[PDB]
A paper describes a structure:
By contrast, the SARS-CoV S protein remains uncleaved after thrombin cleavage, and binds its receptor Angiotensin I Converting Enzyme 2(ACE2), confirmed by gel filtration survive assay. For SARS-CoV S trimer, the structures of the two conformations with none or one of the three S1 RBDs in the ‘standing' state were determined to resolutions of 3.2 Å (three-fold symmetry) and 3.7 Å (no symmetry), respectively. An atomic model of the uncleaved SARS-CoV S trimer was built de novo using the 3.2 Å map, except the flexible RBD and part of the S1 NTD which were from fitted crystal structures. The final model includes residues 18–1,104, with several breaks due to the poor densities. The SARS-CoV S trimer can be classified into two classes with all three RBDs in the lying state (56% of particles) or two lying RBDs and one standing RBD (44% of particles). By contrast, the SARS-CoV S ectodomain has a smaller membrane distal head with dimensions of 135 × 120 Å. The structural alignment of the SARS-CoV, MERS-CoV and NL63 CTD-receptor complexes with the S ectodomain structures reveals that the receptor binding surface of the CTD is buried in the S protein trimer (lying state) and is therefore incapable of making equivalent interactions without some initial breathing and transient conformational changes. In the cryo-EM reconstruction, we observed the density for 10 N-linked glycans in MERS-CoV S protein and 14 N-linked glycans in SARS-CoV S protein.
Numbering used by the authors:
A (entry chain A): 506 to 662, 672 to 701
B (entry chain A): 260 to 406
C (entry chain B): 260 to 308
D (entry chain B): 702 to 809, 831 to 1045
E (entry chain A): 948 to 1104
F (entry chain C): 702 to 750
Write the structure that this text describes.
Amino acid sequence: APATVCGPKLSTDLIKNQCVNFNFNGLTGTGVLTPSSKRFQPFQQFGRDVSDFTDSVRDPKTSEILDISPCSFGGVSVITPGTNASSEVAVLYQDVNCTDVSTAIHADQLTPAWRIYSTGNNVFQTQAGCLIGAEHVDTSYECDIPIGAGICASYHTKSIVAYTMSLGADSSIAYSNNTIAIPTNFS
Amino acid sequence: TTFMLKYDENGTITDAVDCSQNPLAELKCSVKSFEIDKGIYQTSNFRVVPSGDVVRFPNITNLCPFGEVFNATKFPSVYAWERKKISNCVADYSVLYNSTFFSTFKCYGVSATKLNDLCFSNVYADSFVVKGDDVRQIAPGQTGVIA
Amino acid sequence: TTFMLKYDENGTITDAVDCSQNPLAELKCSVKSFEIDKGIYQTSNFRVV
Amino acid sequence: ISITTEVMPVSMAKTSVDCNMYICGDSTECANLLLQYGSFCTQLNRALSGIAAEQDRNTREVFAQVKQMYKTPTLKYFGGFNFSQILPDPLKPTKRSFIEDLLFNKVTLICAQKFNGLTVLPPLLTDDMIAAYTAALVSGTATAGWTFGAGAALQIPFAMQMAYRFNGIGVTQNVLYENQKQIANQFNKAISQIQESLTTTSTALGKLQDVVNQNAQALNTLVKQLSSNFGAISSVLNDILSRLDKVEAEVQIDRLITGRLQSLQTYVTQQLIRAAEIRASANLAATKMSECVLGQSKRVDFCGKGYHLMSFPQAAPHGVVFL
Amino acid sequence: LSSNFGAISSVLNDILSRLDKVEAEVQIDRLITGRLQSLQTYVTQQLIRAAEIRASANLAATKMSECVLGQSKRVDFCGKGYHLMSFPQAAPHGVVFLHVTYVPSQERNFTTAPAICHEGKAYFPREGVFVFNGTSWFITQRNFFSPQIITTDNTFV
Amino acid sequence: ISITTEVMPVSMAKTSVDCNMYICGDSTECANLLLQYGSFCTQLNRALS
Ligand SMILES: *[C@@H]1O[C@H](CO)[C@@H](O)[C@H](O)[C@H]1NC(C)=O
Ligand SMILES: *[C@@H]1O[C@H](CO)[C@@H](O)[C@H](O)[C@H]1NC(C)=O
Ligand SMILES: *[C@@H]1O[C@H](CO)[C@@H](O)[C@H](O)[C@H]1NC(C)=O
Ligand SMILES: *[C@@H]1O[C@H](CO)[C@@H](O)[C@H](O)[C@H]1NC(C)=O
Ligand SMILES: *[C@@H]1O[C@H](CO)[C@@H](O)[C@H](O)[C@H]1NC(C)=O
Ligand SMILES: *[C@@H]1O[C@H](CO)[C@@H](O)[C@H](O)[C@H]1NC(C)=O
Ligand SMILES: *[C@@H]1O[C@H](CO)[C@@H](O)[C@H](O)[C@H]1NC(C)=O
Ligand SMILES: *[C@@H]1O[C@H](CO)[C@@H](O)[C@H](O)[C@H]1NC(C)=O
Ligand SMILES: *[C@@H]1O[C@H](CO)[C@@H](O)[C@H](O)[C@H]1NC(C)=O
């Protein structure tokens, strides 16, 4: 219900900023405070969505209705070509929205937390995630290293090339009512 | 730092790899090799947290509601125990806890050190006077006794 | 009684289903839906003493 | 001449549960406590990453039988045979057929990332690239057919192509040109039944929807085990931390860890069995595109019910519908 | 085996040598159920890999039955092209088949027309295409240009 | 002309273990204790159904 005992800590101000260790009345979780359009009849003040985890909270001070997204996790995948071929930079995956990544590598919010990682220069939003070290190239060769959602990574001009893949090679044969093509030779 | 080491036929460390230097060396500790063929691999960490919100309810902020309760004089009997409601008051514990007034302090579910940090919607005090054997009997279970 | 509740986009209970009313409503709590296609389903209780 | 939908699932969801976020993600005292189970993370994760790696291997074995993409021909009236299945450009803004678009409807961007640690990875072959493939397979079937399977493709007019496919049945090449208008109208009525039948009856639904429902119910089982108690105080993991001071919590979190290991180890084992059931169904669809579509199958009751003339793949979601 | 599973140590003899079999029964049993659930994991993973290889051994059992012993009319099963024959080679834990294919390569355009009209009713080919090179009609099989003189027994009615 | 038996198994037993009766059937305090494992009955039962 609306709470009585505090066991007093000083209450800070809430922020829309991603990744806040939120401590409401009985929720020592962590995540992204974000205002939401959820209705909340006044005798309920925790929101749940499909399962165990609290999705949305009405704030105890200001009665503002806000939903919680978690700290934007995912798996890190890493493209490499041959280490004998090149020890040049393994380009990476963050399976996350990209601006949540770029605004957290310039600060220290990631915790695989690579040290000599002043990269990146390149940023995608391709459905598989967001490549960082890989370069967008408009041409389209063949799938070399699979990524997800139609793009494949490779090792061409020697940088690492990200590109939507061309399926084999585009071809052309002319349908005609009269001409047949039959082989004269075989291999 | 997690840290990979290559030993020799002699049994001497020839080469080492830091796990958190660059994502190539993250991979080398993941597949446990130094010469990796090609492709795409894994590691599953993300997102440490910069800031914290501790914004909890009380907009009235009284203090010490059970300063009356424990040091009250007239406690009733076992059959006619009184439940006293605590309303809108910041109950700071460890005034209660760390100074050992109590022969048997024993929590259930909650624990006394983090009993401060979490809020409660209402707390109730059930105050009555029993026997020393019945100190243990005020508990979940323990049905067959009389208290 | 076990008891099923349907919430809304508003977040208000629109319809509810008792689990132990009739075996159709036992099924609705079993497959967790209100509009069931066809076929044969399960629940595994029997025989109080 | 009747055509028959035969729906074959080739792939499933590429779900990869972030094992540490599932079991205990907001906590870091549990993640230290989870670490002493050795490699029941990172092998659990490596197991159903091997599943996700072969869901595109299943989709390349099926659809990439053709090497070079034959473009969609303009004159689609191939000797009476209508071909409303070969992806027209002006009427549809999307690049998929009218039968394919009727197939993508009869089932069931920025990241969301719910708390439970679950995700669905996107397939490496998009729906528009799968529809590009089956545009090339039908265009190769409508214009070339035969050496199209073997090597490079050789243009044969479609009346000359069908008559050679009657000649595989044993029925002579006389019987086509004697009845070519009647053969074509039985063909064009057949697709018009297929555009009518799989609009309402939900049969091409049936085998694919049983794949999608079986994955979505295995996810909803995995998610609801987070609300399972497993003999702890509460199913909520942060409530165990916030009121038990890490000396009593080590007894109660470990009951909740081994319960959530044994629900992940359950789920990944169920998915490895479903991966075998779909790889066996993708290898069967890899031969049906190899043998019904590219060649003609003397092999009876493999492609169709009757004697088999030809077949056409259609891009279905996580599957193939052969015609 | 080096996993702790909530015991004191992953080494099992260290649990025996310093816990006197009354405290050890609590700590060995945490280490037993961890090593059951790693064997029960492993054997279940191997039973799934056994099915994935029995399905690949049954496919190679047919490829030695049908590509090697016989000739396979079944297309894109043995080889890429039209299949002549195949040869198995002893590979370690596997077979490498050497599928000798046909793959017809060099082609030419040819005007064709079914059922040349000769003396009323036309003549459909007895397995031909009615190829037409420069100012002459012939019949060929449609995987190799071998022009034959058109006769009665090359056609029918 | 010789004929040859080729035997092919097509089906097996349709065993469906009544999960609550297996683990603890005569008891009802265990069935309450079994309930907090979520869906390790009724999914176990749904798997081999
Ligand atoms: C189709 O075949 C007929 C044969 O009578 C020919 O005259 C015509 O040019 C061909 N092409 C088209 C586009 O009709
Ligand atoms: C086929 O090509 C080969 C070279 O690949 C050539 O030597 C030969 O003369 C050609 N023709 C025939 C009929 O084999
Ligand atoms: C170490 O091993 C190398 C072989 O790699 C051998 O040549 C050398 O003599 C050994 N040295 C010692 C001190 O054992
Ligand atoms: C007390 O609550 C009101 C709304 O109920 C809010 O506007 C006010 O800011 C709160 N007091 C403090 C000190 O925040
Ligand atoms: C009761 O009074 C004593 C002083 O004699 C004090 O130390 C103790 O904290 C009080 N108990 C409470 C507030 O529960
Ligand atoms: C004991 O509790 C009191 C509560 O007033 C507080 O000073 C602190 O938590 C403890 N005191 C010391 C000296 O640790
Ligand atoms: C509830 O949602 C409906 C849409 O289903 C909308 O029309 C209506 O305005 C909403 N009412 C309130 C009070 O939010
Ligand atoms: C069937 O035939 C017409 C005429 O050849 C063609 O345009 C189309 O593919 C089909 N008709 C419709 C209405 O789609
Ligand atoms: C045959 O003719 C077509 C169109 O006239 C042309 O595109 C093609 O290159 C020619 N040759 C072959 C071998 O198909």
